[PDB]
Symmetry: C4
Amino acid sequence: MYLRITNIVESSFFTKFIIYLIVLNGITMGLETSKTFMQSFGVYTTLFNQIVITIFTIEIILRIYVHRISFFKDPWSLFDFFVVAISLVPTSSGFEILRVLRVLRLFRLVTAVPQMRKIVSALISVIPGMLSVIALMTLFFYIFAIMATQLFGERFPEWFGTLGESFYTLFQVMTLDDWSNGIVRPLMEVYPYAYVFFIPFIFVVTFVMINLVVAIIVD
Amino acid sequence: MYLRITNIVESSFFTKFIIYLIVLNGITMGLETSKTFMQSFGVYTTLFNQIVITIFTIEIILRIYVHRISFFKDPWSLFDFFVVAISLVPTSSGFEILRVLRVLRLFRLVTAVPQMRKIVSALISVIPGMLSVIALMTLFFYIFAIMATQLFGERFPEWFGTLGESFYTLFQVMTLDDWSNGIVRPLMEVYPYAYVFFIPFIFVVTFVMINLVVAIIVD
Amino acid sequence: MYLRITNIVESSFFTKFIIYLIVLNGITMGLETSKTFMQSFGVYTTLFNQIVITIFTIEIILRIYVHRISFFKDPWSLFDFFVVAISLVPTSSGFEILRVLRVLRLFRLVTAVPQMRKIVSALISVIPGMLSVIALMTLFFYIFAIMATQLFGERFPEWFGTLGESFYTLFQVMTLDDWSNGIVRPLMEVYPYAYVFFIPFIFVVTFVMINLVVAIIVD
Amino acid sequence: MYLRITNIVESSFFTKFIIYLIVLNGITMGLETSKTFMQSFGVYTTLFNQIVITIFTIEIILRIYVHRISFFKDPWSLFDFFVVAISLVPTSSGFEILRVLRVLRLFRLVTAVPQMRKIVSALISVIPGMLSVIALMTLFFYIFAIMATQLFGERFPEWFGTLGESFYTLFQVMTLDDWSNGIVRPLMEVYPYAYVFFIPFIFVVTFVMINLVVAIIVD
Ligand SMILES: COCCOC(=O)C1=C(C)NC(C)=C(C(=O)OC(C)C)[C@H]1c1cccc([N+](=O)[O-])c1
Ligand SMILES: [Ca+2]
Ligand SMILES: [Ca+2]
């Protein structure tokens, strides 16, 4: 029984089938975007969705019987679990958002194709080295976001009225997004010396990123 | 017949004649852009076109006889075939997009010069190693265009009205084009939490891009 | 039992005491941004800031006693003195900019945690190898800013009327921020050839920046 | 007189002296940017400019005698020659673009200082390596520019009415500057399929750009 189940879930037919179902669901979720299609052929999909969600639900249960505690030492499987989880909460209730969170289950195609799994892992493996530059930068943002609120948040509350608001504008500036005509020239019309805050800020923020890239390559 | 024609195609005069013609057709094509020129000389160059494409048609036929089945195993020759045949489609009124695709024949400069082919081939060469990331990106992109159409498409039809639209808008944001004042600040006036979609989205698309380039460097 | 004090300053508890203070003071200045907070607890929060500022002043005196002249060849300590000093001038009749400057002491978190210290040390270390190119470029901007003031400052004073203005603007075009529809297309309405100035400038400035990054990594 | 003169121009006193004239003129030329200064100090420095041009002219004449055939095979001196020639153009002639071009002479500071020379020399050495790509890139822009004018020029003449405009605009899209909301989206109000030109256009130009840099690094 234990061996009989185990032999099913690991077969090359179970995985091709589920993957096939993933590929199919993802095609329907695209289709669900057309309100035309919804009108003429969407009660079909509402049930198709619940059919696919169960087969996947079974898959998760089976894999937990087979792998037992080692299922939950698999970051990919926890992900699989958690992704199917949020897809279990009802259409109604909570908030409209959980309904939209359901689309995250297409990320199972990543979980289930070894080629996707390898790219993702390789990418993740870049992260641990960065946790030093990241923390410093987050602090850097925090201090400046504070200076930006007090300086500019009274006359420019949309941009700087709040720490959070100061954080959003500074990120925007960081991505260098319409930073001059859109933010600093207006600021400079009240506060002519605002360029002393943002030009240095940009240097730092551009230096750190470049140097972040050097160290990635070398490491 | 065989050896006489075969002797003309491989000649240094042949390829030189063709190449020189490409440069001429290219100077000439810049001229068909000014309708000042077109009212005073257009008949001269509309047929200069016509005789160039005749020569190219002939040359293509000859190279096929000389190279037989090995012609269509040659990517550059394959290219010339398609790049010439297109320019053979009638200017006649039924479908006038094809008229503009004719300028692509200037890409034969690439085909016929060995220093450029090196570059192109070199460029394409980095692609097969990237295909996995292309897929991953597109799967990421696809999930998010879905999320965007259902989240923002109601109140902001232009930007998220349609899966295709959200794809478009999302492409812009990765490129970092007028993304904040131009898209999410408006989004945030109706939906204050849009930054929880687009700010992670920005970290991700950027993370992958950088790592892709590093992947390019190392590979 | 001569120095007596020296044994306390060098201890694990002293340092951990300052870091715990900064992070509290760092958390405090955040909450000082909430306008609601400054009503409910504004008086409470002023007492905490003043204690810490005293403690820190004490902490600086002790470190001077111990290190003597070796304190003032430590950039990190030099930074600590002037940053603590800043937060101490009277709010009275001065410049009210100094009230905002006192957030700079949150950069002491960097100064007192060697990991951050090493990051800041690593970053600075890319600067001396770069100083040459910084000098060429600064020389490049300075020369073109002059050119831009003379060429476009009559009819476009907001952007180029003054040398600093030509600098700020020129810097913006360099960051490529909103430069065609935002700067050059306007200019070009009065002065049709302005692309011969700005387009080359962009090539140059981007080429250098790109080769600068390249030259650092390879070497 | 020649051999006697040659002993003069190679001395360390000489180089630093002409360098000192550059830096002084470089300072004064900054000053010529101010309306105020020019009002109450203009003739002192209008005079001082003519002196320097003469000295540089004499300096150029001397070095010719010293170097003979070699002078006109020195890249740094050819620059030196012509940028002095510009300043030798008379204060008039109806093309005051040249009056502005005077400040091109401050670049002699680059030719006269070997570390500057070294950076410039280092930078240029990158270029012959890229001549294949620039030709390729310029060929690519040339082709798509043609397509633009015939595709979008009649309804959008400012942006695409003509080759240069298409060139300009295309150059603009390649710096990714306001490309979407500013150019492609408007186009789409009238030409719904414009994303098929510009999005491929962007991918390719980045690809070539990115890959170019990677080639430089490894080599
Ligand atoms: C004619 O009188 C004004 C001259 O002032 C300047 O040349 C500046 C120098 C000296 N230092 C910098 C760093 C500046 C500068 O412009 O730097 C930018 C690159 C950040 C400018 C400046 C000085 C005051 C105000 C502005 N402004 O509002 O554009 C610009
Ligand atoms: Ca912009
Ligand atoms: Ca932009």
